[model samples]
Target: LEENPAPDFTLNTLNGEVVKLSDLKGQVVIVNFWATWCPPCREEIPSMMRLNAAMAGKPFRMLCVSIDEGGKVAVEEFFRKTGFTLPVLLDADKRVGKLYGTTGVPETFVIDRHGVILKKVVGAMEWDHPEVIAFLNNE
Candidate 1:
């Protein structure tokens, strides 16, 4: 789980609220890098939504980072069309994705309470599957 330290970053939410990685310390964070137009990225949205719902009341957080060239408008459109409700951060310049070593869309990183990388998945996944839920719960 300790290949390299997770890079810290600051980005704005869709609502114009600022978010910084260091500010989210002491929680389990799911940092998912994706784009609106990617098919597999779209495919995982439902599972991510379910996972977000399932993790309520727990010390867990999910940040869906979109690298769409269309930026916030594209993200808003996609979310509206799909009715997805995950919190998103914009990475229009792709600096954050490159910092996270993202080779493509749908890369997800699971960070622990201390902000250490626990798992890194490079493609679409059943985020709310039993195994994932259990792991996130540390069960």
Candidate 2:
């Protein structure tokens, strides 16, 4: 959905709460479509966490959409064991990924407060890069 508003979605989170993109209006949003089995997804999580840290107290939110059917407990265990704080969303039915045209795990979209997809990052990335950081700051 390049240059278009991202498709809205309602998905479950690890905390047993439902998260909907529509509810995040007026907030910058990051949508990461990943799977627990993907190595690149594993590789980029820490950097994602760092990005999360970089934006602390800002109007940004990161929603990691896991395509894994491993259930919330397993994903929670991974985050707990790794000390990851990036917010998690369970895309159990994979609808979010499909709607966003994600071809593989680790696809990420950055949406601005106006609900427009500002950037679409495919595959793994150096999430802590200065340009990336500046972009997240809406630079």
Candidate 3:
């Protein structure tokens, strides 16, 4: 849905708090689908962390959704061992994943402040790259 409005969906974080995509108005949102066992997803997450840190205190939100059937326990354990802190959501049923039209793990969508899907990225990426930052900033 690149350049179109992102389909709204509600999912819960690891804390079991509800998160609705439409509630994220006026913010740049990175909606990513991943799982603990996915190698490329794991590799790309560190850069996602850096990118998130780089956007600190700004109009940005990172929604790292895990589609692991094993649920929160698996994701929680992975984060514990990996030392990665992020706004993770759970999609154990793959509901949100299917809504986003994800073909596989590590699928990502860059949504603008207005909720338009600016980019749909597949596979892993160096999210902290200068060019990436520039694009995210609308530079």
Candidate 4:
């Protein structure tokens, strides 16, 4: 599924606002598939947050899509518990994941501003790695 165009979908965030791929064009987007209960996913959050902070306001953005079936309440609880301030989307049906051929959680897609899939990294990542940050910053 390398270079596959990201399948577009609308999902609710904890803030109750709906987000969609089409709504975020002209920006480098990091879309991740994760769940609250996944330890690996939890483990990667701080690094991701750090990376996000470093690349803040550089046309870079992150949209975390959760496969959690409990919907918004569960997502909110995760927010309440961990307070990871990422803009999240819920995929209860996993239709988008299936479309992207994702068979697991913690998949990451680094998409360019033009909607091209720049890279797809499955599983956890050292999101704060200098090289990773350089790539994200397009430096």
Candidate 5:
């Protein structure tokens, strides 16, 4: 296990549903910090969507937290343009970003079923990459 447990936070989804990280115990979680204006973040959405698909029926959840000042409207429009179906959390005040200690957009944390952070990726990556798929499967 890692020395630090993942920080817990409650944030609203684009649809206004409240999600708490602590409530997702016993599930693998991918916490991604992104912004609508970031090109690298935009480029990474599709892979996230695919990873979301590949993890169906598994013990996994993705929280794509957006630090966009324009809030849900901006994220909704971005979703519309990208056709992304991944669940998104809004961090309009950037509180969650600060909580995660993220330096910039497109940062992702992979948490294990016990909520211990297993990996941290700082930029865009193919989430469905073969090695990633294997890791996601706990294989």
Candidate 6:
């Protein structure tokens, strides 16, 4: 779905705060679908954290969709154990995942300032790669 507008949704973060995709407009948003038990998903998180850090104070946002059946508890356990910190949203039923047509965990999308999807990565990645950092900061 590259070169198209990303579908909008309202979901809650790990802390139960509401986030609407439309509100994230005017920034580069990284929407990632993942699960705790997925090894690839687990491995890519640190780089994602670094990517988030590199974009600090800029118009960039990262939303990781957790599709764990145990809901917040499952995500909490992983976060507690790994000390991973990212804005994670729950999607126990995978409804949002369906909308995004994701086939599995570690799927990622790069949405530009206008909410248009510029990239659709099908698996895990080194998110803090120099080119990825540059791509996110481009006006």
Best by TM-score: 6
Flag regions of model 1 displaced more than 4 Å: none
Model 1 C-alpha lDDT per residue in residues 26-51, reported as the tens digit of each score: 88898999998899998889888999
- lDDT to native, each model: 0.87, 0.83, 0.90, 0.82, 0.86, 0.89
Across 1-139, the per-residue lDDT of candidate 2 in tens digits comes to 7678888888878877998898888898988988777899999988888898888898888898888877687687777787766688887777777888888888889888888887888888989889888876763
In terms of lDDT, model 6 sits at 0.89
lDDT of 3 by residue, 1-139 (tens): 7889999999888886999999899999999999999999999988999998888899889999999998889998998998987788888899888888888888999998889998999999999898899998982
TM-score of 6: 0.96
Query: Tens-digit lDDT track for model 6 on 64-104?
Result: 99999998999999889998888889999999999999888
- Backbone collision tally, model 1: 0
- Looking at model 1, the pairs that clash are none
Separately for all candidates shown, the number of backbone clashes (residues 3 or more apart, or on different chains) is 0, 0, 0, 0, 0, 0
Better of 4 and 6 by TM-score: 6
Better of 4 and 5 by TM-score: 5
Local accuracy of candidate 5 as per-residue lDDT tens digits, 3-74: 478988999887768999998998989899998899998887888888898878988899998899999999
| Candidate 1 lowest-lDDT run of ten | 1-10
Q: For candidate 4, which ten residues in a row score worst on lDDT?
A: 1-10
Candidate 3 positional error at 6, Å:
0.4
Q: How far out, in Å, is residue 132 in model 1?
A: 0.9
RMSD of 6: 0.9
Tell me the TM-score of model 5.
Answer: 0.94
lDDT of 1: 0.87
lDDT digits (tens) for residues 1-139 of candidate 4: 5676677777777777888787778988988999888899999998888887887668777888888888777878987988786768888888888877798888998888877787889888889998887776672
Distance from true location, Cα of 50 in model 6, Å: 0.3
